[PDB]
C-alpha cells in the first residue's frame, strides 16, 4: 500500500543527491544483510506481497524463464525455513544477483492504472 | 519379528491391546503412586496419627 511509483520518486531523489547517497546508502545495504533474506536464497522482489491486482498483473507479464526461477527460490525458502536452517554460504544470493527484476513490470503496470483513475475523473472545460 | 503379525497387523487387535493395556495401567499406576505418596509422607497421615493415640 505504498505504490512503487512513490518510493521510486523518493529513492531516485536520494540516489541523485551526492550528499545523501554518501550518507544513507551505506545504511541501506547494511539494512539488507541484517534483514537476511539472501541467506534463504531470495531476491527482494520475491518478498513483495502478491495479492493485489497491480502486482498480480506484473506477475503475468514476467517472462517464462524468470517465472520458473522465481517459483524455485520460493519453494527453496519454504523448505529451508521448515527445517529451521539457513542455506549454505555457496547458495546465498550475492550482492549482484539481487537485481530489481520485477520493478519495471510493476512501475509500468502501476502508472497505467494511475492513468485510468485520471481518466474517470476528468472535468473537461467547455 | 513376528510381533507385527499378531499385534500390529489387524487394527481390531491393535486397539484391543491398547484398551487391555490401559486396564492394567489404571490399576497399577494408581496404586504405585498412592503407595509412594503416603510413604514419602510417613508420619503425617491420619493412619499414623491414629496409631499414636494408644
Amino acid at each position: 500500500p505504498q505504490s512503487f511509483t512513490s518510493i521510486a520518486r523518493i529513492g531516485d531523489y536520494i540516489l541523485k543527491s551526492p550528499v545523501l547517497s554518501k550518507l544513507c546508502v551505506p545504511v541501506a545495504n547494511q539494512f539488507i544483510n541484517l534483514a537476511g533474506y539472501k541467506k534463504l536464497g531470495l531476491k527482494f522482489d520475491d518478498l513483495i506481497a502478491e495479492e493485489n491486482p497491480i502486482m498480480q498483473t506484473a506477475l503475468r507479464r514476467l517472462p517464462e524463464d524468470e517465472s520458473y526461477a522465481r517459483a524455485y527460490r520460493i519453494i527453496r525458502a519454504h523448505q529451508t525455513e521448515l527445517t529451521h536452517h539457513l542455506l549454505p554460504r555457496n547458495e546465498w544470493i550475492k550482492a549482484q544477483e539481487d537485481v530489481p527484476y520485477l520493478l519495471p513490470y510493476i512501475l509500468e503496470a502501476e502508472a497505467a492504472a494511475k492513468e485510468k483513475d485520471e481518466l474517470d475523473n476528468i472535468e473537461v472545460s467547455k | 519379528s513376528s510381533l507385527y503379525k499378531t499385534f500390529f497387523k489387524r487394527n481390531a487387535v491393535f486397539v484391543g491391546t491398547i484398551f487391555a493395556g490401559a486396564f492394567v495401567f489404571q490399576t497399577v499406576f494408581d496404586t504405585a503412586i498412592t503407595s509412594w505418596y503416603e510413604n514419602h509422607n510417613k508420619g503425617k497421615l491420619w493412619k499414623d496419627v491414629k496409631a499414636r493415640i494408644a
Partner: protein
Amino acid sequence: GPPSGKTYMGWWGHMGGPKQKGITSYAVSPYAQKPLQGIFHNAVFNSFRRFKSQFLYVLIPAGIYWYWWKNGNEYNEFLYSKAGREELERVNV
C-alpha cells in the same frame, strides 16, 4: 451451487500459484529414515545460531523497559520514606 468471488487460494490441482516447471522433489519414506537423528548438534549448535540472531531485539526492548520500571519502583520507595517526605510534599502539591 452459487459461485463466489476470486480468491488467492484454490484447492488441490488448481491452487492458483504460478506455473512451475523443471523442479523435481525427492523424499524418502519416514519408515525408512531415523526420526530424531539430529536432536543433538541442533539443540546445542543450531539453537545457539537462532539465539544469536534474534536476541538483540528481545533484550534491548526489555532492557529499556525494565530499567525504566526499576528506576521508578525504586523512586516510589524513596519519597514514601522518612527521608523523602519533604520531596513528597512538593510533588503532590
